[PDB]
Amino acid sequence: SWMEEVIKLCGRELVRAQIAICGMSTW
Amino acid sequence: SWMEEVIKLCGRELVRAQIAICGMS
Amino acid sequence: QLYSALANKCCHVGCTKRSLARFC
Amino acid sequence: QLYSALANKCCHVGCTKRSLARFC
């Protein structure tokens, strides 16, 4: 799974990743 | 505007607010 | 303003929706 | 204290997508 991928991001980029992660994790 | 509203949230609740704010503007 | 400092501020003292909208 | 700490780690050291997924 994509959940094991490691990221190093800050600010807007971190927020956008958070958004996309929760967006992927939904039914 | 709606932007001046104050919030006091942590963790999971902050994240949900953040997501709603970005979907709104 | 690290996003982590704003997240700390929002949880402990409050923040405006405007301050979080800048990180979208 | 938890999300602000995780966002600092993600920005300065790195973090897994699973750590962020816990906050959804």
UniProtKB/Swiss-Prot annotation, chain B:
The chain holds residues 26 to 50 of 185 of the full protein. This is Relaxin B chain. It comes from the Eukaryota. It comes from Homo sapiens.
